[PDB]
């Protein structure tokens, strides 16, 4: 019970597919020592047309030029540190090189879990009830159809699903009738192809999960919010109040819940016409940003991502069939307090990602380690005088959301 092999046993590892698909080009090397703590990008312009019998545009009002912004900011530090007594570790363990392996994997795995939360928290679009899993071919093609119907062309669309869900689609694929290669591939390797239903399907086992949060009562909007373009031209976030809730519950609406407005429908952003889902028009939806409680009298104040712009003096920026006013009926999708692992579908230009280089800390031994293109700074110091050494590995991430209306969550439907 003394001799031990010098080779370590293998362990477990997750995968990276989300960080590879998100945009890492626009926000890269832009947060420098001159820019400051934040940087912003411009927004496209839209115009309206006036129809008259003979010109005479004198009476009406010409289009007004309003400029938007999309600011990106930095996050907190990703830090892993160890502390030890050197004699004991130096017995048979090399320079904490056994530590060297699974630390970068921890730092990178955390960056991807934070990306998953950011995208789920700040997405807008939603499809299907959260309860049903993915079993059939239409459940994947609906996302591509919806994105194409909205009007996004410049970019590239992706969809991410659980490991178990992919097998069910392969089981459907093995049931095909005429494609020899597809049937053989699905029978042998149980691998679905690249282009699935007009969108690229991807399989990931490391994906964040969320809790619904208890709610009850037929909710309704109490006061008309401000949804003009001037108010929401910088963030696409607005504040709304709800009534008819429960008596007094904490954590009434968790972060990531979808709130659906029944009587206000989506619009094709270019032609400004309603959206029809084959048999019923598509309703507007938004995502909660932060946790919200309920006070006595059922008054819930919540901040949502995704805005139903219905400006009357600037009609060119409308994004909803009709204005939300007091007395409208809303609903929350999902059950009372269940926990599920959602699936994400998004465009290429939905969220950004970047890294901030960190300079060497003065008079301290250091090095730089690379992992999937991510640089990690490591430092070693000896604060304390009791055979006590210290190590630390760090990364600073920067996240940006361009337009919430090009991504969200999707589930199966019955």
């Amino acid at each position: 019970s003394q001799i031990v092999l010098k080779k370590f046993l293998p362990g477990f590892m997750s995968d990276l597919v989300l960080a590879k698909t998100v945009d890492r080009q626009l926000l890269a090397g832009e947060i420098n020592s001159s820019t400051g703590d934040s940087v912003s990008f411009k927004r496209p312009h839209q115009f309206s047309s006036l129809r008259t019998p003979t010109g005479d545009i004198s009476g009406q009002n010409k289009n007004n030029l309003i400029s938007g912004k999309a600011t990106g900011r930095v996050g907190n530090y990703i830090t892993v540190a160890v502390e030890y007594q050197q004699l004991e570790e130096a017995i048979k363990l090399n320079q904490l090189e056994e530590i060297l392996a699974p630390v970068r994997q921890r730092i990178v795995t955390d960056l991807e879990t934070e990306l998953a939360h950011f995208m789920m928290n700040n997405g807008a679009l939603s499809l299907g009830s959260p309860n049903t899993p993915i079993t059939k071919w239409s459940d994947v093609a609906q996302t591509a159809s919806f994105l194409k119907d909205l009007g996004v062309n410049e970019g590239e669309n992706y969809a991410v699903m659980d490991p178990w869900s992919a097998q069910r689609l392969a089981d459907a694929q093995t049931g095909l009738h005429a494609s020899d290669q597809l049937v053989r591939t699905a029978w042998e390797n149980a691998q679905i192809p690249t282009n699935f239903g007009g969108i690229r399907a991807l399989m990931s086992n490391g994906l964040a999960s969320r809790t619904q949060g208890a709610f009850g009562g037929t909710l309704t909007v109490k006061t008309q919010p401000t949804v003009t373009y001037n108010a929401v031209k910088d963030s696409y976030q607005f504040t709304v109040t709800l009534t008819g809730a429960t008596a007094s519950v904490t954590g009434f609406l968790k972060a990531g819940d979808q709130v659906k407005f029944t009587n206000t429908y989506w619009l094709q952003q270019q032609t400004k016409q309603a959206l029809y889902n084959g048999a019923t028009p598509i309703s507007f939806t938004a995502t909660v940003t932060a946790d919200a409680n309920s006070d006595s009298g059922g008054d819930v104040t919540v901040t949502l991502s995704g805005v139903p712009i219905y400006d009357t003096t600037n009609p060119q920026y409308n994004s909803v069939s009709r204005q939300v006013e007091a007395g409208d009926a809303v609903s929350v999708v999902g059950t009372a307090s269940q926990t599920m692992k959602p699936n994400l579908f998004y465009n290429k230009f939905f969220c950004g990602l970047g890294s901030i280089p960190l300079p060497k800390l003065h008079s301290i031994d250091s090095a730089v380690a690379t992992y999937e293109g991510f640089s990690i700074r490591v430092h070693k110091y000896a604060d304390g005088d009791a055979n006590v050494q210290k190590m630390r590995f760090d990364l600073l991430p920067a996240y940006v959301c361009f337009n919430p209306h090009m991504g969200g969550q999707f589930f199966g439907n019955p």
């Binding site: 890269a28 090397g29 060297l100 890294s355 280089p357 300079p359 060497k360 031994d365 250091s366 090095a367 730089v368 380690a369 690379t370 992992y371 293109g373 640089s375």
Partner: protein, 152 residues
């Protein structure tokens, strides 16, 4: 054009060969790496200042040494050998020798031959040839896109 001989500094931490080669001269190798250090100012001088610098990680040196200069970026040159299909054109002009086979790179319009001393004759035999490509890469992507070098 000219052939040049250049030195390589710190070969023990810069040159890495295909692990499938066993000969002394590494003739049976399909790819190799050649690493070298660089400064941020010279990194910005070439390439572009727009993308931040990402360097290769080896965790090789700093083994019992005090390090003070964090202004070094590690860039590597990547070599590939490929077998590709190339069309050889045999200009069979009888004057001053007849049998002359040339690759598709040199063309009557790319090279100012203009059939003055060349007859097109046969230009359809396609043969596989051994070619070598070079590229410059870092920890992020391609600093220079691959291009073929004149050799075997």
């Amino acid at each position: 054009q000219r052939i040049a001989i250049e030195p390589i500094y710190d070969p023990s931490r810069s040159v890495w060969f295909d692990p499938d080669a066993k000969k002394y001269d590494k003739s049976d190798a399909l790819w190799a790496f050649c690493m070298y250090s660089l400064s941020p100012e010279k990194y910005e001088a070439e390439y572009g200042k727009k993308p931040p610098t990402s360097l290769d990680v080896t965790s090789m040196t700093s083994w019992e040494y005090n390090w003070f200069g964090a202004d070094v970026i590690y860039i590597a040159k990547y070599y590939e050998v490929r077998k590709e299909s190339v069309d050889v054109i045999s200009y069979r002009h009888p004057i001053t020798g007849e049998i002359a086979t040339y690759d598709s790179d040199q063309v009557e319009d790319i090279e100012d031959e203009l059939a003055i001393a060349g007859f097109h004759e046969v230009a359809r035999r396609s043969v596989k040839r051994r070619r070598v490509y070079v590229s410059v890469v870092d920890g992020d992507g391609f600093l220079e896109k691959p291009r073929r070098i004149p050799g075997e």
